[PDB]
Design an enzyme around this catalytic site. Structure first.
Site, PDB file in Angstrom:
ATOM      1  N   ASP A 141       0.826  -1.205   0.000  1.00 38.89           N
ATOM      2  CA  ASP A 141       0.000   0.000   0.000  1.00 38.89           C
ATOM      3  C   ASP A 141       0.864   1.260   0.000  1.00 38.89           C
ATOM      4  OD1 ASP A 141      -2.442   1.285  -0.111  1.00 38.89           O
ATOM      5  OD2 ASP A 141      -2.619   1.474   2.076  1.00 38.89           O
TER       6      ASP A 141
ATOM      7  N   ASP B 159      -3.322  -3.136  -2.238  1.00 39.02           N
ATOM      8  CA  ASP B 159      -4.455  -2.201  -2.268  1.00 39.02           C
ATOM      9  C   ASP B 159      -4.378  -1.263  -3.476  1.00 39.02           C
ATOM     10  OD1 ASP B 159      -6.810  -0.962  -1.470  1.00 39.02           O
ATOM     11  OD2 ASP B 159      -5.780   0.445  -0.111  1.00 39.02           O
TER      12      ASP B 159
HETATM   13  C1  LIG Z   1       1.310   9.389  -3.329  1.00 33.66           C
HETATM   14  O1  LIG Z   1       0.980   8.056  -2.995  1.00 33.66           O
HETATM   15  C2  LIG Z   1       1.440   7.650  -1.720  1.00 33.66           C
HETATM   16  C3  LIG Z   1       1.168   6.360  -1.276  1.00 33.66           C
HETATM   17  C4  LIG Z   1       1.614   5.952  -0.020  1.00 33.66           C
HETATM   18  C5  LIG Z   1       2.333   6.828   0.783  1.00 33.66           C
HETATM   19  C6  LIG Z   1       2.807   6.382   2.140  1.00 33.66           C
HETATM   20  C7  LIG Z   1       1.789   5.428   2.721  1.00 33.66           C
HETATM   21  C8  LIG Z   1       4.138   5.671   2.047  1.00 33.66           C
HETATM   22  C9  LIG Z   1       4.866   5.256   0.896  1.00 33.66           C
HETATM   23  C10 LIG Z   1       6.017   4.628   1.458  1.00 33.66           C
HETATM   24  C11 LIG Z   1       7.155   4.044   0.674  1.00 33.66           C
HETATM   25  S1  LIG Z   1       7.521   4.553  -0.888  1.00 33.66           S
HETATM   26  C12 LIG Z   1       8.867   3.548  -1.105  1.00 33.66           C
HETATM   27  C13 LIG Z   1       9.721   3.499  -2.344  1.00 33.66           C
HETATM   28  N1  LIG Z   1       9.036   2.807   0.000  1.00 33.66           N
HETATM   29  C14 LIG Z   1       8.116   3.049   0.995  1.00 33.66           C
HETATM   30  C15 LIG Z   1       8.146   2.323   2.315  1.00 33.66           C
HETATM   31  N2  LIG Z   1       5.957   4.704   2.777  1.00 33.66           N
HETATM   32  N3  LIG Z   1       4.853   5.306   3.089  1.00 33.66           N
HETATM   33  C16 LIG Z   1       2.608   8.116   0.350  1.00 33.66           C
HETATM   34  C17 LIG Z   1       2.158   8.526  -0.904  1.00 33.66           C
HETATM   35 NA    NA Z   2      -4.412   2.572   0.012  1.00 30.10          NA
END
Ligand SMILES: COc1ccc([C@@H](C)c2cc(-c3sc(C)nc3C)[nH]n2)cc1
Ligand code: NA
Ligand code: NA
EC number: 2.1.1.6
Length: 219
Positions: free
Chosen positions: A140, A168
């Site tokens: 997600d 998701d």
């Molecule tokens: C714009 O769409 C989004 C979707 C999800 C998030 C949050 C939930 C998010 C994404 C991540 C990542 S990215 C990545 C390369 N490794 C991780 C662990 N951590 N937390 C932020 C923006």
């Molecule tokens: Na989501």
């Protein structure tokens, strides 16, 4: 100053009950549907997640993209003693919120929060976090990373036959490259769980992809 994520946390701390994960889930869902929109899996998809966890009773779960900790609370509350959730979160402030959320819920001893990018952290799981293989993965995080991180999990040897991937937002905004790959590959047995986003009035869905083992070389 104040951020939406800080506000979600405060709302929970005010209205939920410490040590009661269900009340924490309900406060977050109430906040996100009544007070202020936020990236949130939500209770409808939440019940699908619950059912998957109950069916497979995973001992080791990896979550990609913790945000404020809603899904971490959702899954960790259903884990057996000795079962572990590892959750990865790229934003330090969100990682901090997720930790406080889990602490309030009383689930902090079931969860390890890793602050960093999935592609940096995934190859360290075996060495640094004493992982053999994962029983379940919840995806997600950034949608353009579902496919490359799935390929990375496979090549790092973190998937075994029967490992469940649950992803998701595969319809909205969509992860067509990921779906094409797992549905088409003999290494994954896939099912689709449709769920309505009422606030957006469009159907979305989760994909469940069960790892079958690697593809066999030609004889
Ligand atoms: C714009 O769409 C989004 C979707 C999800 C998030 C949050 C939930 C998010 C994404 C991540 C990542 S990215 C990545 C390369 N490794 C991780 C662990 N951590 N937390 C932020 C923006
Ligand atoms: Na989501
Ligand atoms: Na397939």
């Amino acid at each position: 100053g104040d951020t939406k994520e800080q506000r979600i946390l405060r709302y929970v701390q005010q209205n939920a009950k410490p040590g009661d994960p269900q009340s924490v889930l309900e406060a977050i869902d109430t906040y996100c549907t009544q007070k202020e929109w936020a990236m949130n899996v939500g209770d409808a998809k939440g019940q699908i997640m619950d059912a998957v966890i109950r069916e497979y009773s995973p001992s080791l779960v990896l979550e990609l993209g913790a945000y404020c900790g809603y899904s971490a609370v959702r899954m960790a509350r259903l884990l057996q003693p000795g079962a572990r959730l590892l959750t990865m979160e790229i934003n330090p402030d969100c990682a901090a919120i997720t930790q406080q959320m889990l602490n309030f819920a009383g689930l902090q001893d079931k969860v390890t929060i890793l602050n960093g990018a999935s592609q940096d952290l995934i190859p360290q799981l075996k060495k640094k976090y004493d992982v053999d293989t994962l029983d379940m993965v919840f995806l997600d995080h950034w949608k353009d990373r579902y496919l490359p991180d799935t390929l990375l999990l496979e090549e790092c040897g973190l998937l075994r036959k029967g490992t469940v991937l649950l992803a998701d937002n595969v319809i909205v905004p969509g992860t067509p490259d990921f779906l094409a790959y797992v549905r088409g590959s003999s290494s994954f047995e896939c099912t689709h769980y449709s769920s309505y986003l009422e606030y957006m009035k469009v159907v979305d869905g989760l994909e469940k992809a069960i790892y079958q083992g690697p593809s066999s070389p030609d004889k």
